[PDB]
Write an enzyme that holds these catalytic residues in place. Structure first.
Site, mmCIF file in Angstrom:
data_model
loop_
_atom_site.group_PDB
_atom_site.id
_atom_site.type_symbol
_atom_site.label_atom_id
_atom_site.label_comp_id
_atom_site.label_asym_id
_atom_site.label_seq_id
_atom_site.Cartn_x
_atom_site.Cartn_y
_atom_site.Cartn_z
ATOM 1 N N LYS A 2 -11.302 8.736 10.370
ATOM 2 C CA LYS A 2 -10.102 7.916 10.246
ATOM 3 C C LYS A 2 -9.055 8.423 11.241
ATOM 4 C CE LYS A 2 -7.216 8.431 6.692
ATOM 5 N NZ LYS A 2 -5.941 8.569 7.394
ATOM 6 N N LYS A 51 -2.173 0.761 8.742
ATOM 7 C CA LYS A 51 -1.346 0.200 7.668
ATOM 8 C C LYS A 51 -0.633 -1.084 8.092
ATOM 9 C CE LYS A 51 -1.067 4.443 4.988
ATOM 10 N NZ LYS A 51 -1.750 5.283 6.002
ATOM 11 N N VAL A 52 -1.438 -2.031 8.558
ATOM 12 C CA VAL A 52 -0.920 -3.244 9.166
ATOM 13 C C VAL A 52 -0.004 -3.980 8.183
ATOM 14 C CG1 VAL A 52 -1.555 -5.369 10.302
ATOM 15 C CG2 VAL A 52 -3.023 -3.343 10.537
ATOM 16 N N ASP A 103 -7.939 16.374 -7.521
ATOM 17 C CA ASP A 103 -9.190 17.115 -7.643
ATOM 18 C C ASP A 103 -10.356 16.225 -7.240
ATOM 19 O OD1 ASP A 103 -11.453 17.886 -10.250
ATOM 20 O OD2 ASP A 103 -11.132 19.127 -8.470
ATOM 21 N N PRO A 154 1.472 -12.990 9.636
ATOM 22 C CA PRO A 154 0.086 -13.305 9.990
ATOM 23 C C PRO A 154 -0.243 -13.283 11.489
ATOM 24 C CG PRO A 154 0.774 -14.666 8.136
ATOM 25 C CD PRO A 154 2.005 -13.908 8.609
ATOM 26 N N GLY A 208 -9.087 13.471 -0.733
ATOM 27 C CA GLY A 208 -9.721 14.552 -1.466
ATOM 28 C C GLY A 208 -9.204 15.903 -1.007
#
Lengths: 213, 213
Positions: B37, B67-68, B178, B72, B176
């Site tokens: 990522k 995070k677009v 817990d 539109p 991640g």
């Protein structure tokens, strides 16, 4: 005096994605407009180095319409990268809350740049979550000392409600609903296609400024 | 079968901002992780060409954490530029509403790529507007046929609520917090600093994968 002066109250929304086209059009209208808003389509396509190119070729102010909407640490890094590239200002979402906005304000303070808070949008779909949050987002901005705001003009009276919340001193920019109605509340209007798709962008810009008067 | 297979259920959050460091670390861990990522700090600093570089050097999948969050037409352009650069998937905010999400889905369908809907965040400030919208955003995604979701794991039980709304067939990734109980609900976990700031990233990745059992 503490907010920016936008020449002729007209901001160019430079939404073309090709560098040659973007530079050509911007060069044609620089006599009329000293403030250009650029977004991700152009910078992702051509690189962030294009920001310095606009400023060096044209001596225009650049507002980065990046609608920053991440966690504080990431917002900080986006703002720093964007200001390092030369942006004078950056547009930030308020929906992610006060800490995310403050992260941007922190970097702007450090680097001597500006944050614009986006309080509302008016595309279809904005009614779902954005419109109900708009007044509270604007108040959050005011409570945080935000001085620059972006609001929609599809409903000029909403622009009036926003202006009501932020006071007369704050700087407000909006797209150019009817420009006549919009300019009662906004300090400058943002114009895109009618200029950048024009056969003669210079003439288009010149005409827009005349109507603004 | 219709959602992605993430090797070892471990996604690297490559949040470093310089190319040399990002490439070095990713190279050290590629034996263990096939999905990386990348966000704006890296791509704005080094250029979108870095996406193709990750894919060509490492043959990893790239998720663009952008995070677009625009209207539109602009969302469409951001997605197209991002997929053209090689991203396999893009992360999209739901707060701006259904039409803004659908714009992204349209381009993903055209180009054979994936959209991840971000349903919720858990940084300070997320309680103001995001948390109260989360369930409705998730339901909006389901109603639109979104198959891939990103959710927070600070409250694992919230991940259970999300998993409840989206069903067992949808693909869900989460940080991640817990990992033990996050993995009860998420298909893969996202790990950053623990790996990329490690003196020995390879060992860090290897250890993480073992813990995932």
């Amino acid at each position: 005096v503490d907010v920016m002066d936008v020449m002729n109250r007209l901001i160019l929304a430079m939404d073309l994605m090709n560098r040659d086209d973007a530079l050509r059009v911007t060069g044609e209208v620089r006599e009329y407009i000293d403030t250009v808003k650029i977004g991700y389509p152009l910078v992702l396509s051509e690189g962030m180095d294009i920001i310095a190119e606009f400023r060096k070729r044209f001596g225009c102010r650049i507002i980065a319409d990046f609608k920053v909407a991440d966690i504080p640490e990431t917002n900080e890094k986006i703002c720093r990268a964007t200001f390092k590239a030369g942006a004078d200002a950056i547009i930030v979402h308020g929906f992610p809350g006060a800490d995310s906005v403050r992260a941007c304000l922190n970097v702007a303070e450090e680097m001597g740049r500006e944050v614009f808070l986006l309080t509302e949008m008016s595309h279809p779909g904005a009614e779902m979550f954005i419109q109900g949050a708009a007044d509270e987002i604007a108040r959050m901005g005011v409570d945080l000392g935000v001085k620059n705001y972006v609001g929609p003009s599809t409903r000029p009276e909403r622009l009036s409600r926003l202006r009501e919340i932020i006071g007369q001193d704050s700087f407000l920019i909006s797209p150019g609903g009817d420009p006549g109605e919009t300019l009662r509340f906004a300090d400058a209007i943002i114009v895109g296609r009618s200029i950048y798709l024009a056969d003669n962008p210079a003439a288009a810009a010149a005409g827009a400024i005349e109507s603004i008067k």
